[PDB]
Design a protein around this ligand. Structure first.
Ligand SMILES: CCCCCCCCCCCCCC(=O)SCCNC(=O)CCNC(=O)[C@H](O)C(C)(C)COP(=O)(O)OP(=O)(O)OC[C@H]1O[C@@H](n2cnc3c(N)ncnc32)[C@H](O)[C@@H]1OP(=O)(O)O
Ligand SMILES: Nc1ccccc1N1CCNCC1
Length: 411
């Protein structure tokens, strides 16, 4: 069972999710006035803390907590090491709410013990196309279209409890307090991803990886040398050859995105994303924030030929600590972010992403099978990884959809 999740406005089982036919809320309507004004009760030795995520020292404290306590694989080989600059970027988008960044510290020594972050997002989350068809076939179109308008909701990320405080039911308390602060802002839905199975995902997708520095990936045991390679006199030489990339981009007119590109990038991105069942809606300010290049954080390139931007891609950087190998500090990973192609095939656009990532010293390129990411898996030599990324809503009934109908990239 789920002692915490069984108390929450989420579908409880897979059989439950398969009965859902229209998008809409689970909970009864509430007002801000109904929500307790005071923070959720916590042990007298602990205190709630709202970090100022634009203050270098507060960012650093969050950085340390995550560096030492955030997502690790089951074999404790790698742990995310989100940079301070990345954290400021991720947590402070346009119109962010400082109160949605929630921490727990120990009163006695002020040691940070836990964290959860919420940021605003405008999300299309109305009934999916295939279910709208079923609704039309049943004469149920009005119900199905009720929540079509993009919604201003909360995106939750960076949930983390210190290793010393694991399995003490602190995570539920963090979630309840985050929910309270978000509710007090008159927001009633959230979206989040997890690599674990909880009640109850609306979409699940496999991870994919594209080796850029195969020798390093083998050394740190991220990858193995596949059995067939042992038929070669020099397995490693053949592995390096198979994953080799051009030393410079192949698309003429590829350049870094500039501020003047924001309107055209917004247009082509929004045109593209609107085709998916679940996707964000971005203002000029949000395009600028999430896509303009930021050193060591986000990398974005446009294709400009005949003086017009026709295509773009973006990727972001999350290095992981290489826990057990003493020869390497970090695994430098590039993550496929947003993109749009109108003039060239997607594989041709994303080949340039791999080329740029490789030339900038990235070891691997990662993605989930959302958007049209499946369309270039085979040609660009991506391989499926371990497990799945699952997408969830809080207080939103939603029918199961394919990951190829999801257009929300999570950081
Ligand atoms: C309207 C606004 C709403 C806003 C809120 C929306 C909801 C947001 C939801 C959060 C979205 C987060 C998105 C991300 O950031 S996903 C990334 C989560 N972080 C990590 O994996 C970092 C390393 N691990 C940890 O820090 C801890 O192990 C965590 C914090 C994960 C659990 O701490 P701990 O190990 O010390 O356990 P506990 O005794 O305190 O708590 C046990 C309960 O917690 C449930 N649990 C375990 N893992 C997750 C998980 N990943 N999402 C949601 N729930 C999770 C579990 O089923 C159990 O409940 P139940 O089975 O008894 O019922
Ligand atoms: N986005 C993504 C693609 C491949 C593997 C992992 C990820 N994520 C998902 C969001 N959390 C950070 C890492």
């Amino acid at each position: 069972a789920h002692a915490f999740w069984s108390t929450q406005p989420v579908p409880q089982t897979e059989d439950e999710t398969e009965k859902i036919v229209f998008a809409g809320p689970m909970d009864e309507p509430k007002t801000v006035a109904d929500i307790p004004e005071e923070p959720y009760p916590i042990a007298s030795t602990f205190e709630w803390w709202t970090p100022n995520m634009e203050a270098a020292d507060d960012i650093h404290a969050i950085y340390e907590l995550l560096r030492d306590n955030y997502v690790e694989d089951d074999d404790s080989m790698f742990r995310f090491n989100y940079s301070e600059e990345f954290l400021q970027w991720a947590l402070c988008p346009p119109n962010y709410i400082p109160d949605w960044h929630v921490a727990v510290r120990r009163k006695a020594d002020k040691k940070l013990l836990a964290f959860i972050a919420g940021v605003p997002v405008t999300l299309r989350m109305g009934t999916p196309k295939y279910m709208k068809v079923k609704a039309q076939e049943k004469g149920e179109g009005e119900e199905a279209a009720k929540y079509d308008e993009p919604r201003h909701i909360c995106e939750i990320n960076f949930l983390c409890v210190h290793k010393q405080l694991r399995e003490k039911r602190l995570a539920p308390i963090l979630i309840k307090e985050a929910t309270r602060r978000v509710n007090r802002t008159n927001v009633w839905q959230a979206v989040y991803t997890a690599g674990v199975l909880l009640p109850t995902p609306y979409a699940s997708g496999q991870y994919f990886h594209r080796s850029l520095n195969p020798e390093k990936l083998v050394e740190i045991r991220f990858s193995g040398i596949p059995a067939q390679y042992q038929k070669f006199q020099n397995p490693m030489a053949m592995l390096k050859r198979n994953y080799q990339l051009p030393s410079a981009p192949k698309n003429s007119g590829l350049r870094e995105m500039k501020p003047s590109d924001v309107p055209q990038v917004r247009r082509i991105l929004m045109n593209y994303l609107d085709s998916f069942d679940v996707g964000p809606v971005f203002s000029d300010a949000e395009i600028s924030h999430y896509l303009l290049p930021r050193d060591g954080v986000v990398f974005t390139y446009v294709v400009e030929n005949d003086k017009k931007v026709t295509d773009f891609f973006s990727f972001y950087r999350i290095p992981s600590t290489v826990i057990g190998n003493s020869n390497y500090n970090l695994l430098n990973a590039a993550y496929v972010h947003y993109y749009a192609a109108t003039s060239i095939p997607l594989h041709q656009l994303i080949l340039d992403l791999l080329i740029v990532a490789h030339s900038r010293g990235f070891d691997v390129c990662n993605m989930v099978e959302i958007l049209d990411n499946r369309s270039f898996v085979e040609q660009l030599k991506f391989g499926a990884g371990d497990g799945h990324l699952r997408y969830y809503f809080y207080n939103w009934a939603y029918p199961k959809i394919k990951p190829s109908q999801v257009a929300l990239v999570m950081l």
